[PDB]
Write a protein that binds this DNA or RNA. Sequence first.
RNA 1: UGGGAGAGGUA
Lengths: 44, 98, 543, 1340
Amino acid sequence: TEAAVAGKRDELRGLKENVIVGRLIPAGTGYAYHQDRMRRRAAG
Amino acid sequence: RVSKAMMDNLQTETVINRDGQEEKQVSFNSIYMMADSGARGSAAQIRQLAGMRGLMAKPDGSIIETPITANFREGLNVLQYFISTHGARKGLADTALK
Amino acid sequence: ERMGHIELASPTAHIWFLKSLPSRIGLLLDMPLRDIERVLYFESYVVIEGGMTNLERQQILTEEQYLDALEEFGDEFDAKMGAEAIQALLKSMDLEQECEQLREELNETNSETKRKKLTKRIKLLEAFVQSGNKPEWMILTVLPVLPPDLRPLVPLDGGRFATSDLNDLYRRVINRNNRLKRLLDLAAPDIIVRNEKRMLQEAVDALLDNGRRGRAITGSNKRPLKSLADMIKGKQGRFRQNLLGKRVDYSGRSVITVGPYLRLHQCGLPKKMALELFKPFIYGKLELRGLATTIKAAKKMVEREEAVVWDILDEVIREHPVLLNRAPTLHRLGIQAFEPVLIEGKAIQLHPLVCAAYNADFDGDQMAVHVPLTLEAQLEARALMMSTNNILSPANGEPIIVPSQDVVLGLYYMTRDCVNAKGEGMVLTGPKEAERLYRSGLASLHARVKVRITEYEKDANGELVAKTSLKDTTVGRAILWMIVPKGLPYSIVNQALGKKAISKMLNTCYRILGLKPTVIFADQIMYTGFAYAARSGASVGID
Amino acid sequence: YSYTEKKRIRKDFGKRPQVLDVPYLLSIQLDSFQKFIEQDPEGQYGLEAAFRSVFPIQSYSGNSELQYVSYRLGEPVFDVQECQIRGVTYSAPLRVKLRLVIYEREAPEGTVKDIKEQEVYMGEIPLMTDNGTFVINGTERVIVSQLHRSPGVFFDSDKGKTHSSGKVLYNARIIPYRGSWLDFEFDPKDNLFVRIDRRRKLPATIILRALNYTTEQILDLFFEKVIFEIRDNKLQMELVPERLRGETASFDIEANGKVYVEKGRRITARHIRQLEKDDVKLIEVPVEYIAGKVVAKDYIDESTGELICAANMELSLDLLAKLSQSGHKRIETLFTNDLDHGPYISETLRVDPTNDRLSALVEIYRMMRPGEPPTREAAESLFENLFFSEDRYDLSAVGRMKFNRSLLREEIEGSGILSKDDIIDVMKKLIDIRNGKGEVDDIDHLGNRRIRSVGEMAENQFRVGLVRVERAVKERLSLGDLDTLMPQDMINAKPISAAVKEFFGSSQLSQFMDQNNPLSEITHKRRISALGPGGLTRERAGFEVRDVHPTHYGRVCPIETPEGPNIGLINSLSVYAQTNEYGFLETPYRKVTDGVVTDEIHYLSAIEEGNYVIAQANSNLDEEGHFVEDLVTCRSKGESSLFSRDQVDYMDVSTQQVVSVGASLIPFLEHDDANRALMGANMQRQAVPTLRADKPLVGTGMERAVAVDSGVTAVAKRGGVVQYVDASRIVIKVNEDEMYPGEAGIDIYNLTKYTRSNQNTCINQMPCVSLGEPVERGDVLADGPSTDLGELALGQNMRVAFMPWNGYNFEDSILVSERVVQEDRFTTIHIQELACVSRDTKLGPEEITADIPNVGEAALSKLDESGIVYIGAEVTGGDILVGKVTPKGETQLTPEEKLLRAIFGEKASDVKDSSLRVPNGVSGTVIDVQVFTRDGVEKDKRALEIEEMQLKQAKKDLSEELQILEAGLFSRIRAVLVAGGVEAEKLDKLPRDRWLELGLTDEEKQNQLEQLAEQYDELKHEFEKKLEAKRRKITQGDDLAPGVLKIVKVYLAVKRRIQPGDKMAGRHGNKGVISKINPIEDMPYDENGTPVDIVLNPLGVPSRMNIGQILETHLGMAAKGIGDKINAMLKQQQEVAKLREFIQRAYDLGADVRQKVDLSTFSDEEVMRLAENLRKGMPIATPVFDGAKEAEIKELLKLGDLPTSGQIRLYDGRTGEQFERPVTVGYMYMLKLNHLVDDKMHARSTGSYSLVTQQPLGGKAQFGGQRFGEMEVWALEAYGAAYTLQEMLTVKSDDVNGRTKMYKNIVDGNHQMEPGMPESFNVLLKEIRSLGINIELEDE
RNA sequence: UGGGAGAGGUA
Ligand SMILES: [Mg+2]
């Protein structure tokens, strides 16, 4: 209710978030892939 | 006092020795062995087996005045077992909650 | 993936943005929730706009007051009753004008309750303006429909149907909406059409959240129906039952027994259970080796359980780690990867050392076996989750792969010493001659004897210097010196070894040597602990 | 001893002489359901109570009513075993005679108008079997008794809920048996409140104003009056001296000329005695003492006519002045203290905003039904029908008894509704509780909880169905026709039958019977579950109701309860605990008389136990004299203390009365810990009955009582001589003195062989008696599933060593020898019923035939020509059992297609095959095929073969019945012939069947001969019509489900040997799992050479504190030592006299044992049979809490020529060497639990998937995948295995494209990952969007 | 085949 009224968005930066969505978590082995994706989003 | 006398008579009962004189050493009793090794149990469990059972508590928190004097070798009577069932069911109920 | 929509005749209010406190409609319109509920329940009129100074904005009139005002003015004011009145009120209000007026109102005086209510309303109004939503969108005019394979229609075994509760709730909303359309076309009386509008509001609010507004609408078997908010929220909701924790293919389950002949990184899977686990891998190796042309031929060759299928399974399961999970997985050592070894039976033979990490005794326990498929997943299970890697507990830096109760009893009975047992006071050429003396029977495990010990100390670099002297030992400590690796001192071994002492032995061996000497030391100390506890005969009795 | 007791006498080590026999252990359910059925017209129980509490019922006017006459229960159509085979409810139809009386409205009382009565068939109530069970829809159910709070009144107080104050808030409550509640309570401001039906609060005087009371009557009922008198401008105070106790003198209380109290001085007790011995009454008082007191009654002036000061107003100086100049010369004033008389009703009257009775009723209406516009008649009817109506409020026996005991009244009976005096006394007692006189009630006291058994719950559900039917009958009688309307056309049998079938089939207490062994049956019937309809939950249950209350001593076992979340809610009934008339729990006690422990026995409830002082059962007696010691141990007022030997008033009846059945089958219970005894008593209810049951060498003596009264064996009704012993039946000839002359005197005990139970085990009854053996009344003739000669035998007792063995017994694990698997000791029978139903589809019926297309000889090698597997054919997984094929084309035709069928012919139209196959892993031989069909469908050759075999067996059974009936009638004609004349030789020189044509001259004995011939003709006549009825019943088809032609049921009997993984347990909580089967050459052997059968772990003794397993080990070693000595004497065949001498020496061994066996009565055959039965070990009865001691155990060990320490020198069988310490060896009675690794092991590669989320299913029965829960997701996050977490959430789960590409890639060798978004997230997105909240995946 | 309740049990 609070998120729908305030019009929030999720930036997908949590381990529980990437468990729910279905990606590699930024914890351990997936950290290299997530920082590569972050620098790809920053450089472009 | 009963637990201390029990622990003394279980730790150093092996005294029948030879080749120097009548000497004393730690006992080779298996109950004391599986207690002193840290394998399974502790001195509280050995006290309930051989010494005195101790003071058991009511479910209202207050300690009952007369204690369970018999151990698990001489065998409890009926009222001491019914007193012990209070703490046993309380501990089993507490474990599920935690 | 396709939704529908129901075109509601009277626009009803969303129950989430009305009943989830703070109500957001009372916080936006600055009206009490009881008065808003009286308007929505068609009990009392509310006035939207009025040109006269007698009737202001949001003055909740009764039926008698509205019948007085209708014959008094009748032309200047417009007062409506129900959720359509609240929709018109949220339409006629002005977000930036009310935000500016409350920003001026906050500045003169600051009582505590008034400033908190005003800053709550200002945060709410600024949230609407910065998000770009409109306040009329809280009033549901068009209601969407879940897809019919997400509210499915599943049968039973006896021809009768067992639908979901969402189909029942959608049937209620559609029937009352169609009846409201029929009553608005039939020119019904005011009491009947008002009750039907109230029924549609109750049905829509029940479908959005059954147990929220009033009495929960029960089904046919006297149980309250499951709404959309009950599908998502709760212990058996969508999130905590399917999104976080899912059911998982390529998975088994069996009782666990003891295998003490294993190494630290092995577990005994049964033949039939692992054949059922590794079945597409057996399909791939069968079609690769040319023993099956098609997938149906490979399926039937596995289902007939041939000797070439067992040989291919023995080749597939070699060096392919599986995860042994046991619920409840409290800490992270409740999942470990083991290189499986095929045994004949029906029970997963664990190692005795890892059952202090699993907190598992063999009184009827059960463990799940999950199979990593991809090469990345096999490398996680080989480099991160292998049972020879996580020796130390992550809670405190102490080894959890520790001897427990049986190895401990055996090692205590070994390194304890009697006074005049058998063959006291000899001199021995070393640990091998001490082991030879015990297994020949000329000396017990408790003879205080002088042995020659060649211990290896550590240099400043990785070299190992040696010293050799005579130590006043027992025969049991001189048997364990065959087991203790090169790099540890003799004061590691030269006392009676309780559980804390063996924990300090494994910790010292870790910090000095690394991981691989620590793994082989744990396996060898478990073997000798089990063997000499068997040779002891440490029995309990009534004497 | 009985003649089946002299076969094997269990040596009893007990010392207490038991005075009371153990009662029938299934007495609670049998007595309650017998009271529910049987006709009690005065003390109304069950159906008569329900009929007389509903009927008669008039119309809304009153011109028509139904009078109840009587009722009678019909006969059941099928028997018990026939209902269990056919799969239908075992019930008796209820027929009730109901009379219709019409009242005339033209006459003033027109009663004699129309009398119409008939038997309105309504309801089919189920019946109980002779062992306490119901048969509902084929299965067997047990309705558990319920321990609910008894009706009455319960004062209680939350011990400091207000954390700011800390005060104690006392609250009353009036709990009825049926109706709305009533709760009186206090607030922190000390005002009395009322919450009717747990609604909002009201001031408590508003219900008194609803009871037509003003302030005058309320104050006169509650508070007592002090009087103030105004005389010549001074105040005269009437003063009784017992009121200045504990208070401070505000003024100088003086006398006419005597000074008693001073200013600022407490009026002490010596001053009170001074006042009552001078006896002064009139005491003067100044004006400032009146300011503070309130006025009792109103005061209206006679001249003006208006209220000067009304009731309950604050009196002050100006109101005192107004009253004195008005002229009310006598002032009545309330009494108010701070110690004994608190002003609660006055403060509640000042808070109360009502005016009078109609305003009080309007406010009660506004509380109860809010939002309704109240009026006078609706408020009056509401407040009348909440409490003071005979139909919407009822306690009526137990609530009225508890009401008059908690309010200290006299009569234990009275009305069933509340009253003005009842509510007033509850408020008075609560005020006294608040003041201090009295003490509040505990809720877990067993005088407040009550057993609501099967008959009471079924009577309540029958009354609910009767309420629905009487509503419908009132609706019919108030409007419909009266003259030509019979009552059975009005009274519908649907609501009563629907309600009683719902309770008996799908309630929370009518649960599936756990009957995997006789102990589990008997402990499921002696069960008191505190849950159910109208009880607790597992959320609303704290440590108050779960823990043991001290009033459970004797009534409820403390060491028998499930160890999960039902840890105090499911409590088991004790041994001797009976049930009161009202429903409370009562125990036997030995009443003492002047120190003499008299054999008379009193039953004392839980309220009467707390009054007297009761001795412990372990007090010594001087051969029915007095006590021995002076300070006997006793218990009183819930606590245990010491007392003198003359103050005791009661003694315990036995030392077994504290425990349940399952906790009194454990030997050496007093040495075990209570937790391990709890787990042992819980695991004894899961022991699978093995192939050959074997007795325990160390028992209790309770095993015989359990095996007899479990209703599972075949005890002899009447004693006699057995005539024919078979494996299927036992024919016994009765003795002469126990035979009535009416019957023949032959009992035929049929034995159920290999009947499937509820938990898929077998039930077979092997006979133990031999041919030609005199057995008396009450002897076990046929041993049940787990019995051995009338003793309960749940497991096998095998040789057990206590030593760690090479790691294979690490943590509770068990290493089993190869002798246990070679001798087939622990291999049981698991009968499993598979069922193949034949539907009636919309394209044609499903035919059962062997013309199965697209299948070969490898599946049809076992089927016959009818499509049903042969009895005895060993099948495996995947083999076709019943050949069934569904039509895929059509079957119905038109006459155009009829003529074209005569032209051309038919087609196949049998494409889709749905034959019944064996589930994978299941094997075993078919033992029974039962083919039920419908009346109308023509049968097949296999079905006709089944009916032919059943007809031959039924014909043989009824021919045996006809033979014993003609034998009985021939005995009767022989008896009357010898009674008439003296004829001996001429009767038996001629065949027995030709005994009818004999005669003499015509007389009265000739008339007896003709009527006996008439009885001969009608016996044959009833025989042949019974044959016709049995033939008709087996020929006709059962009425099955709609759309079902025929049903085939195939029974497979698997045989389950033990393997690594199978669970095992003892009786002392020492469970385990078999880790290895270790060969006989590797097992440790002793000096004699006998290998150990099971190597246990000795480390489970200190950490669990169960010494009972070691004492059972020592006692079993001594028992088998005596048994091997008797076996050696029998192998050498020494002497019968030497055998008798050694057996008597072994039996007369204890110090002060209870039993005494003398072999002088025993003949030669009895001693030889006893030695033959004791060659496998001498059984020992060790009672609970009064068992054998270490001195008797060591004396037995020294008799049997064994080491007295209990430990032998075991040699290692693997390497030949000797173990360095002596190892405890001895026989332990090991069970085999029902947790089998064949049923626990499960695996899944890829199977079926769910429909909403498209993730794999869950369960071994539906080929499910293991759940990767939230804890395991956190464990993978802690590891950092992000790739393993991704491939366990996407491609092993709900993502169809990813999992299909993963399957193809794994088959094609390339282990690569093609991920995607799961579909549960899309389910979540669509559900939030269907809630109406726009959530989208914003790209970039 | 798949879904939902109720009861029992194992860790
Ligand atoms: Mg366990």
